[model samples]
Target chain A: ADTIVAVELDTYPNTDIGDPSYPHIGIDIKSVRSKKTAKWNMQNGKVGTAHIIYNSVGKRLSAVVSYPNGDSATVSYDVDLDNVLPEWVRVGLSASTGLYKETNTILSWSFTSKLKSTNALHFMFNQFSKDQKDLILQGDATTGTEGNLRLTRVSSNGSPQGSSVGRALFYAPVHIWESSAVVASFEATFTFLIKSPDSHPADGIAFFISNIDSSIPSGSTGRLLGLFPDAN
Target chain B: ADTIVAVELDTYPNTDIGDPSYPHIGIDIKSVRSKKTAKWNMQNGKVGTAHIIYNSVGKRLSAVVSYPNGDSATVSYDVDLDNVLPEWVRVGLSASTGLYKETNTILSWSFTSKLKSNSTNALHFMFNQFSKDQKDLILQGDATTGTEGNLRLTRVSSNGSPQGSSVGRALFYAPVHIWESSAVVASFEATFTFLIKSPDSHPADGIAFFISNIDSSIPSGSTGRLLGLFPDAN
Candidate 1:
């Protein structure tokens, strides 16, 4: 496992997976200085709220320990905006060229053009916003439907499993900077999924909506096949 | 803030909302005990890999971690899936027969239906899937294409404000269960949208595909709204 790095979302919370009794959010970062407001944002699933105790198990991960210093850690894990994507795109590595599936769905998808930025440190999420005329948006995209999913591209290591997911890693290809904060103007949404302890099959799917070419990888067999013809 | 109790998913590893961070596969989660071993399972993201790790700023959060000790940590965060969506079929909280929309984007949504099971914890996603023909889908939808967004429901807090962008919390009125481990044997397709963060409006929107339509909750307004509008349906 990776060294005990100073993680803002310091502790892992799911009891079904192991740590039952649900511990309060009080981390003991490996080596970084004590913090007050730190947070590991979300890139997937719906949304909800965060725990005041922090080390508490929920979704959005982070840490708040009684550091040896005992400063009463209190980091306001803030959310912010990062980059701007090309207006019209299918998201591919080379350029706007790849398997441009007529539709982007559970079984189909459309390729996107070149990404606007790279990656390295903080994983950034850019909204792949769809307008009223793109050939990919589904479910009532008539430019005025209130129930429409007028999408925008905003991925944090939380959503798509592509370059956007783990951009926080040191070895990753660092990209641009996030402009807005979550309080009001974050490009990426802040949230996480629970439905874990991974009960059975016929579950659900949490996919990585990328505009890349054939490079995107796939999950275990029979699982994420809908995304790729097969999978990695 | 409202205290969270639980969570669920209708879809696992959505085709449109996934990345390739093994173990940390996008939208979908991987088997914890062992990839494809049945010990743990995920629907559609990355393949065999270690634990999925999410970054934490200053606080730690408890999650329904999978595979490991039944709890690992949330490596993935909630991403709005409204970038993509279908064209027609109005979205409603009470009456599907009455709530309909066309020519507009779904700003936000949250509806709850009776649950089916918690046996699998597979309801990681609530897909808006369909088996209808492409032409049929196109004919029935109001979008320019068939691709849709999947971020329509918001996990509601006992308070309201819908957990749409805060912590990814939502409620399912039904006793539905998720196969957080497997896929829906039913071969269906879903299309929906995710809005971008906006001060007075949505941030943006995106597209997503799903394989179902399960219980929903309107974390935004309060008390979950009903889907399939079947007060007596489900």
Candidate 2:
């Protein structure tokens, strides 16, 4: 019955006229009650997004709210969420009317099963390095100490680029599923930036989970997109 | 007792060396009991991150683990986590060993308290326009609109001098608390993109959301880097 709900809201009740009101707008999990909710500040009428996650095995929950204007809040709970689902899990918004009687709207809603553990190496390269002492690197792939972490830097300078290939493998495998039960499902989200050395951004990067160990082949760039053992 | 915990890892122990071990890096909520934990696939040795959450009111928990290399997992359980804390909720990692041993680490962790209900305003701008039909808005200085929903302020004719001093204000008659109870706290989150036009490839000063009682009196030509907020510079 545990789930992670990452919600994005484009509209909020405008509470900037006289006095701010209560129960503006929120995401109600298993219940519309007070405790089972992730509240949002609807003032300033700006754009905002909220992420609410429920980890059932650990019996805890997390809520992260952020705005384009810089107002944000984070909250967590240790309450159980087993009794909050039906035959199928549902996602929606809940709101109460008051002096600021405005209807709240949801721009986007995402509900996915988050893994029990992590697949990310680290948010930063420094911490990633310390945590990944056993990471295996092959081919032209290189790791350098920087103010930030580096995932894959093909070359300080790419060729006219017949092909550029590199491989960096972490030492830990992530748990995909257990008991092989249909009762379990999961989802993941991540962000990364890629820029070419010059005016070139070709073939892109391919990130995949595989049975292949830490080893790279020669000519596996460009067409292969850094996936196969060798070039495409 | 409420808190959030996020963990990231890059390497793990694999029994590939002929050792079926125990306590190979896992998430421990209340206790180290086997069932109270969700295991990871330490064999792949891929960079990854995990997001765990609990819906306290519903007595349920969930785990979302992800690897940048594309390996990930999600598991949910119905467990009671009321105890596991005193007043300040605690969050950390747990592990054990039995033969083939290896060191594991956590990359990041976070915790916070979310409110039951939000105290906000009714914010919808004419389905994406500033023509102002419902009243309760203030626009000062020089800002215009183009195409559909573009609030183009400060670059009307792209003049040479400081022509970017426009302010837009929307007022909300908001209530601070749901019943004036100390238990309720207020917060907000929003996502929007501010882009410089195609012809203009430079960066603007910045945009800000201010909660002020009095109407802003900054002049049209009084904007530079600090977007029209005149402080105690008298």
Candidate 3:
């Protein structure tokens, strides 16, 4: 029970798959005595969303992001999370999910690119499990600046949930930066734009922070973020 | 309505009255055609706990932070804000009185510190008037590194029977610096600490927020933000 394994997306080159379908960046962690707790966040202008599926110890998830088709170059991956719970934790970001067939599209995005180079993105990792006690990101989703973003639970020994429950919340100082000018200090702001030729585009994007460790599975299709739907 | 008056204090110098007793670091703004709201904050760590009085006419308020503080301070200017609403709209950090006032001081040493600063310390504030639908600063007191030190209000807008009121809420964040040792950023991290010396602190310091055009008046003191016996905030 002293082994820990995790799948990381260090070499993100930007990929796109398209509606009802899109490129996916994800990981699956499991094989432990007790359920694990994880915290994740994005950097800069392009922070993304993660959807978890519940099914006991074999938890799965999908780190999904959307962008304007072909108009935007490769869909790089800047979304990755660190599992700092106990050691009995292990994960595979690229876990194969025969789940491609029965997956749910938790959250999605469609950015308005006004660049020939790279469209800005930002993200960070807050917390999971326990909506009442502690929220996900401290100051909500912020712009391209770095640090803790929010604060970790102070009353240590017990996490935000106190016991073991799932929760998600956005802290204070809500800030957003967009480079709208033709060529100046900044540009037009980009929003959580939805995708076109959509399938489940109506559910929009959902944020979940729960103590349900069984929902740790992230299949292939971009639907992994909120891909798995269960009672976990 | 033609002449303007203002008071400023930057040193830990004392005065005739204020929190911690004997000698505070604030001034009184009085005598006006028709008072409106007032705005203020600090640029250093000096404290400011006042018991100001106000008349009708002075209304509206706006506050902004710029520096830091290790101790505490407050701006207790009185005003009748019943014109704003029936209930009190309390904002900012909070503390307790009565059994809670055993040591739940209105302000502590440090509860939250703004980002991007080291020597300067600005805590909380307490102004009686505020204009709604507008983003303005009211009399405020903040903590540059720790919790806001001292602040109290006596006579709230309406609930002045010296009983208990429920008007406490805050717009604070707990932002941890990237380098706790680096002491220079552009945000803040906070944790509200309290003080309760006796079991019954007058009016119970159950602060509030209101909107009006009145001068600075002292609240229901004894156990308050020093703005008088009322938690008349905006």
TM-score for each model: 0.18, 0.24, 0.26
**What is the docking quality class of candidate 1?**
incorrect
Off by over 4 Å in 1: A1-73, A77-79, A82-232, B1-110, B114-142, B145-234
TM-score winner between candidates 1 and 2: 2
Ranked candidates, highest TM-score first: 3, 2, 1
Identify the leading candidate in terms of DockQ.
Answer: 3
DockQ for each candidate?
Answer: 0.01, 0.01, 0.04
Q: Model 1, B1-234: lDDT tens per residue?
A: 211111112111212322122322123211111111111233222211122111112111122223322432233334221211122112221111111111122222322111112221111122232111211111121222223322222232333222222212222212222111122221111212232222222111112111123323322422111111112211
Alpha carbon lDDT of residue B54, candidate 1?
18
For candidate 1, report its TM-score: 0.18
Please provide, for model 2 over A1-232, each residue's C-alpha lDDT reduced to its tens digit, 9 standing for 90 to 100. 1222212221222334211133222222322122333344533334455555555565555556667676665555565444433212222222111121221222332334432222111111111221223244544444443212233342344222333345444332322223222323332222222333332233322223333232333343443334433211
Positional deviation of residue A7's Cα in model 1 after best superposition, in angstroms: 6.0
Across residues B131-167, which tens digit of lDDT does each residue of candidate 2 receive?
A: 2121212334444333433344344343522232333
